[PDB]
Amino acid sequence: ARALRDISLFNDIRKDQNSVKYIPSLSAYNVFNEFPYYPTSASQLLDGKLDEFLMLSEQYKSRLPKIRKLGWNRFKPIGINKTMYELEMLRSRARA
Amino acid sequence: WLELMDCLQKVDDALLLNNYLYQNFQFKFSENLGSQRTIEFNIMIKFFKLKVFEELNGQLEDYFEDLEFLLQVFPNFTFLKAYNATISYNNLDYVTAESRFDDIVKQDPYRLNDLETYSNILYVMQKNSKLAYLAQFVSQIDRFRPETCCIIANYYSARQEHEKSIMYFRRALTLDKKTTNAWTLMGHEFVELSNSHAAIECYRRAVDICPRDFKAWFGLGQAYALLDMHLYSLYYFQKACTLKPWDRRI
Amino acid sequence: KYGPLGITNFITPYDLCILILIHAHCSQDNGISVPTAVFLRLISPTRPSLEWNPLLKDNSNLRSSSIVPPPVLPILDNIIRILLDDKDGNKIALTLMGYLEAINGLDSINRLMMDLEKNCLVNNYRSMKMRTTSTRRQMTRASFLGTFLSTCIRKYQIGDFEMRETIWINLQNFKTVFKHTPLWLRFKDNVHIQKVKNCLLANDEISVEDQQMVEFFQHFNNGNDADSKTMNEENYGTLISIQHLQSIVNRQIVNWLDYEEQSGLVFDLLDTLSLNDATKFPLIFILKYLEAIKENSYQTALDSLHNYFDYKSTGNSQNYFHISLLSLATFHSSFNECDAAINSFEEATRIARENKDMETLNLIMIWIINFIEVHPEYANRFYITVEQIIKYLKNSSDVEDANIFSNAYKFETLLSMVKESKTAEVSSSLLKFMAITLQNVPSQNFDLFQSLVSYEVKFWKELGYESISDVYEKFLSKTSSSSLRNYDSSIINQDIKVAFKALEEDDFLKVKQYLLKSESLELDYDQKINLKYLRVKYLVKIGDYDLSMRLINQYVKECCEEVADSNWRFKFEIESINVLLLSDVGIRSLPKIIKLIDEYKEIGNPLRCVILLLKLCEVLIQVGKSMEAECLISCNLSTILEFPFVRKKTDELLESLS
Amino acid sequence: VVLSDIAHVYMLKNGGSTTVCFPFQIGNAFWYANGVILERETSASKPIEFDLKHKYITLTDPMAPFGLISITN
Secondary structure, three states, X not given: OOOOOOOHHHHHHHHHHHOOOOOOOOOOOOXXXXXXXXXXXXXXXXXXXXXXXXXXXXXXXHHHHHXXXXXXXXXXXXXXXXXXXXXXXXXXXXXX | OHHHHHHOOOHHHHHHHHHHOOOOOOOOOOOOXXXXXXXXXXOHHHHHHHHHHHXXXXXXXXXXXXXXXXXXXXXXXXXXXXXXXXXXXXXOOHHHHHHHHHHHHHHOOOOOOOHHHHHHHHHHHOOHHHHHHHHHHHHHHOOOOOOHHHHHHHHHHHOOXXXXXXXXXXXXXXXXXXXXHHHXXXXXXXXXXXXXXXXHHHHXXXXXXXXXXXXXXXXXXXXXXXXXXXXXXXXXXXXXXXXXXXXXXX | OOOOEEEOOOOOHHHHHHHHHHXXXXXXXXXXXXXXXXXXXXXXXXXXXXXXXXXXXXXXXXXXXXXXXXXXXXXXXXXXXXXXXXXXHHHHHHHHHHHHHHOOOHHHHHHHHHHHHHHHXXXXXXXXXXXXXXXXXXXXXXXXXXXXXXXXXXXXXXXXHHHHHHHHHHHHHHHHHHHOOHHHHHOOOOOHXXXXXXXXXXXOOOOOOHHHHXXXXXHHHOOOOOOOOOOXXXXXXXXXXHHHHHHHHHHHHHHHHOOOOOXXXXXXXXXXXXXXXXXXXXXXXXXXXXXXXXXXXXHHXXXXXXXXXXXXXXXXXXXXXXXXXXXXXXXXXXXXXXXXXXXXXXXXXXXHHHHOOOHHHHHHHHHHHXXXXXXXXXXXXXXXXXXXXXXXXXXXXXXXXXXHHHHHHHHHHHHHHHOOOOHHXXXXXXXXXHHHXXXXXXXXXXXXXXXXXXXXXXXXXXXXXXXXXXXXXXXXOOOOOOOOOOOOHHHHHHHHHHHHHHHHOOOHHHHHHHHHHHOOOOOOHHHHHHHHHHHHHHHHHHOOOHHHHHHHHHHHHHHHHOOOOHHHHHHHHHHHHHXXXXXXXXXXXXXXXXXXXXXXXXXXXXXXXXXXXXXXXXXXXXOOOHHHHHHHHHHOHHHHOOOOOOHHHHHHXXXXXX | OEOOOEEEEEOOOOOOEEEEEOOOOEEEEEEEOOEEEXXXXXXXXXXXXXXXXXXXXXXXXXXXXXXXXXOOO
């Protein structure tokens, strides 16, 4: 892959003379949601082959905070008519 | 009997096994009740005839007189009629198959055993309303059987929603891996999705489970024929020829 | 050491073995530093990705400039034999042996994993110099071992408890396998294990009550065989990741293609895949394909080839249909189908256009004439003439080619040599091909370097200077052959040279039996002509000339129409001169020889001119006019001794004149 | 090459490979000018029973349908 320019000789002469779409694979489709997995970056695509370990690493990393993120938004306790999302919002404004 | 039927692989083996059951096979008359140990008047030997001779699509012998004999003794047996309906289905006689199956649903409404062919017939019939009834009705019983996840997939395929139907076929296979018929159907829903790369693997797994799969070879042969690679598909079609030579379609 | 094989995306028992050694090296409490050679043999195969196309490209970058030891199988027997070799390696090996005895539970495995992340591994070197209070060596993420340990740590938190549970079943299954080996008996007790085991087993926090039941929990799970064992699912004997398996197979096929390896162990283990590892690892199919060609199996080879291109095409996001056809096209040319390969190749061009990608077309064109080079008789059948490609490839680009120009000029040199062009152009064209090939690395591009030697040894041999040819002949590789040309072609080629030697030594029985094999073998065109030419020379020796004369003119006539091979036209032609003049009638050859003399005077090939002089001299002495033949040979005696292989005919003629 | 119930015809001079089936099992195969004669498998298991009405098959090329022999007194 010297490209004819990494050769010092022909590189010298030239100076003197001057004077990818992605498609899902079968393993990409999962069982629970019909949306197939889409890689985030080309690094996860090993020479056009989807790394099963790499895709399963991002899947674990995504689901991990999702358990922590459970109470945000919709979830509302009894006796408080406001959810915890804007509990931290007003808390942020309290000190600031 | 079913484990015995599974170990059989080719029709010629059945003829060898069928003979052994006749000349040098006798039951223990002590354990079994009288007038039953006779091979000619048994019932399991008969039920063996209707099962192996047609699931392997083997040459029929001693099969006609036994079938009508079983219909007389067992007029209300649900398993017999569905097998009787399947025989018409296997002969590409769909209209009569529909009438036979319609008796099953009325007589036995909760049977997720042979309905996979019923929802298979309805897809070709294009009776989307009748199929839509079945998908809602079957799914209400339970969604964990292999068939109920195959009944719905046919209904979702008829509505040209492939990215969702492809999901259920993989679901239907995960519950019971023995249902290898879902591989070829899973392959078809990729071809209609204009995704040839994914289809090729899907068909190829089916033949690696069992090489004697005419459906898998043909479905894999077409996927190459859809592309310009006409000659590259000749080998796949040639292999499928040996499986079922007596077919006009191939 | 054998067992069922299965791909695992988790911490394999082999992976902990490196994790054991790296713990000893970094702890620096025992003062044992693992040799750098041991590490570079263990982690390096685990490093991700090498890639290898089936054909159409051979060892372009897979070859290592420095010879590397084979990758190590994940068995404690094989791992120990590496460390054991050193005179002080028993101390290093026993350190690994001691640790594997210390980790008796799943919690102990987590202790090693927790220890490294909190203390050993370090985010960056900027925090290294501030951590001078550490009693253990610390490591950077970007280092060789740092990037490995990060992946290994990542492979531990990526799993649930079922993942950690399979680690400990397999490791004890992996450990107890080594227990029933002769090597374990030699190390049954060495007392260094007890010292190192007690180094880490300390601070157990209990020795009287819990340790009584800790043994019970371990023993009951283990197969004590006192009663029926607790029933559990079948467990694999060996666990390997995809990357490590890739290193083993790539090394095996390369070693097969052309420190001792274990062919039996690797082949046996690879045959026990659960048929789903084969899908995740398509290269197992081609490993059968290479073996199938060795024994020359037709049906078996095709099935494995098709299997490899069904799983690979789906895995590769890039379109690979345009590559599948050529490999099948190459396979057909390997079995001398020829015509069947042409139809398969035609559909490859059409598929390439649909992709609308330029880089693949250069690969298609390169494969075109390489097929033509092996089978020149099919140059007319193609939709593109050979000269059209050379004109394109010469002015293809000035960058992102590297090897295209090295290929392009080599094909011009063959066409020019066959066209019997002036030796002025042939030397210049060969100079271009030689200059570019040696400019870049010739070691990595082993295919073209061998082709250079084959041409140059052929180019200088036709000129008559065996001295130059001998030097380059020592660089020509034997039994290596090339792709898309059979597999027993090397055996046949060595056999032809034996037959020619047998002809010189008057072993007529041997050459006669070989000619029988000739009529029923499937031979390449270049091999065809040699045996076609060998048959003519053998028939001249016997004495029957009516058959030979009717035979030789048929050869040359089809050596000018079917293939425009001028070099083989000349060698056949002079044989027609020899059979005539040997039969005391050489006068008929006079119009033919003189037509070649002045024709080859313009070409300037000194061998061609001199060999015609000897035939001319031999004609003149059988007419009764030896007087002028002596006068002609005397003036040219100086310039005819420079050619060695005509000296024997020259010297023999001198005694005739006396 | 003739198997128990499948024949493979590999073209050597030119072309690829073909494969054909048969109505029943074949005992042995004998070559004749332009075709093959196939003998049915007689008995297998030990009962010994066999067929005699027609056990010979004539085929010219793989693609064409099989033929039946003719015997006269």
